[PDB]
Amino acid sequence: MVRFIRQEAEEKANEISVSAEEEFNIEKLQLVEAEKKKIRQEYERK
Amino acid sequence: HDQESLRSSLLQWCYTSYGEVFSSWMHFCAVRVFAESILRYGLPPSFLACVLAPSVKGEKKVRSILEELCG
Amino acid sequence: ASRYWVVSLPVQNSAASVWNRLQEQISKHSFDTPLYRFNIPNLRVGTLDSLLALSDDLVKSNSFVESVSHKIRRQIEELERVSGIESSSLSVDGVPVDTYLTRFVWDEAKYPTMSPLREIVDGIHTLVAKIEDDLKVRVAEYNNVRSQLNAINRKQSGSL
Amino acid sequence: GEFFSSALTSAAAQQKLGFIAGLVPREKSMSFERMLFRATRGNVFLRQAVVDEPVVDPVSGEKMEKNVFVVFYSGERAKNKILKICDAFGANRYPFNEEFDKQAQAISEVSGRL
Amino acid sequence: LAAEQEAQHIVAAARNAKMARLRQAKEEAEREIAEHRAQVER
């Protein structure tokens, strides 16, 4: 009854947190790509 | 002749679609087993019911046996 | 045809002599009851709200199943030439009525996703709706053929 | 407020849930158990009165055996049917605060206003 | 009850601690960017 509801709530929270962490990692990869691009631009300017 | 063939060949495809619909109904019954399990037991799917087309006496005997969970 | 006739009992509420006796060795053998079943649980189940939503949608699922059954029993049989598909030919989930009703193997990846069934049930319902739409298209084709039937030959045989 | 110590203990013994605060007449015992089986599912707990005194209707002072009760809803999806069941009960229903002291204070204030 | 404790701060704690994983991702992103910048400058 309530224990099964407890497992579902924890499982949903765990999956959501993992998905958010993966999305943050992807966003970080995009951020480092943008930083590398701007570093290349400034190096070319120099 | 074309209408007869459609009732024999195109409607043969209709009968095949009816068999596919029977398969879909079997899947629906499988889902309903877990639905009943969730309704009258814990969340995880686990059922011990049965599906058939019995006589009135057999259904009455099954209801007498299962009166511990009567509606 | 025949409407739904499945019993309702969870794993903890088996009506047989033993909890695992529902499949076989039950008292139903003495009464010659054709009841049979086999477990096939999904990967995971939804929450209490998801369970209530699935229970609410079960009414629509049953209505769609009844519509499909009525279409299959009417359109095929009325043509007087489409009812040749027997139980083995119209086997549910690849198994005849003897074995289809004795197991829930239809819960495999064909109609559902073998996953949390909260949306898999809706997906299987949509697939069944598509199948019923194909059956209705076939029925409409049969009706148009019957319109082609009873053609100009229905008039008098000449000199009339 | 009486259920804040009774229904809470019943839920603790039986154990996210909704509040089914409201009312259920003395003749609503069958509907609370025989009916609403899909929503309650037998895992919820409830505390109900036996209409010890005739409770006036929310828009009528004639009163009847309108016992008031508070229960737990099995989520919002089940609370949707629980609200319909409570409306079908048609007794002197009014939500109260979760805290027992706050619910008692609200009851006293409503009685003073009456 | 048990269900109330399950829906209590137990899950919100992980929901807020996901910010720690986000901060770790930002930190590793900054470290990688700094390493690349140092390499290209060299």
Automatic annotation (TrEMBL), chain B:
Its name, as the record gives it, is V-type proton ATPase subunit C
Q: Its biological function?
A: Subunit of the V1 complex of vacuolar(H+)-ATPase (V-ATPase), a multisubunit enzyme composed of a peripheral complex (V1) that hydrolyzes ATP and a membrane integral complex (V0) that translocates protons. V-ATPase is responsible for acidifying and maintaining the pH of intracellular compartments and in some cell types, is targeted to the plasma membrane, where it is responsible for acidifying the extracellular environment. Subunit C is necessary for the assembly of the catalytic sector of the enzyme and is likely to have a specific function in its catalytic activity. Subunit of the peripheral V1 complex of vacuolar ATPase. Subunit C is necessary for the assembly of the catalytic sector of the enzyme and is likely to have a specific function in its catalytic activity. V-ATPase is responsible for acidifying a variety of intracellular compartments in eukaryotic cells.
This chain's source organism reads Citrus unshiu (Satsuma mandarin)
Q: Which family does it belong to?
A: Belongs to the V-ATPase C subunit family.
Subunit? V-ATPase is a heteromultimeric enzyme composed of a peripheral catalytic V1 complex (components A to H) attached to an integral membrane V0 proton pore complex.
Superkingdom field: Eukaryota
Instruction: Output the lineage of the source organism.
Output: Eukaryota, Viridiplantae, Streptophyta, Embryophyta, Tracheophyta
Automatic annotation (TrEMBL), chain D:
Question: What superkingdom heads the lineage?
Answer: Eukaryota
Q: Where in the cell is it found?
A: Membrane
Which family is this protein grouped under?
A: Belongs to the V-ATPase 116 kDa subunit family.
- Write out the function statement from the record: Essential component of the vacuolar proton pump (V-ATPase), a multimeric enzyme that catalyzes the translocation of protons across the membranes. Required for assembly and activity of the V-ATPase.
Q: Any idea what this protein is called?
A: V-type proton ATPase subunit a
Which residues of the parent chain are present?
Answer: 147 to 291 of 823
TrEMBL record, chain E:
Q: Which domain of life is it from?
A: Eukaryota
Coiled-coil residue spans: 12-42
Q: What does the protein in this record do?
A: Catalytic subunit of the peripheral V1 complex of vacuolar ATPase (V-ATPase). V-ATPase is responsible for acidifying a variety of intracellular compartments in eukaryotic cells.
**Of which family is this protein a member?**
Belongs to the V-ATPase G subunit family.
Q: How does it assemble?
A: V-ATPase is a heteromultimeric enzyme made up of two complexes: the ATP-hydrolytic V1 complex and the proton translocation V0 complex.
Put simply, this protein is called V-type proton ATPase subunit G
Native source species: Citrus sinensis (Sweet orange)
Q: What is the lineage of its organism?
A: Eukaryota, Viridiplantae, Streptophyta, Embryophyta, Tracheophyta
Q: Which residues of the full protein are shown?
A: 14 to 55 of 110
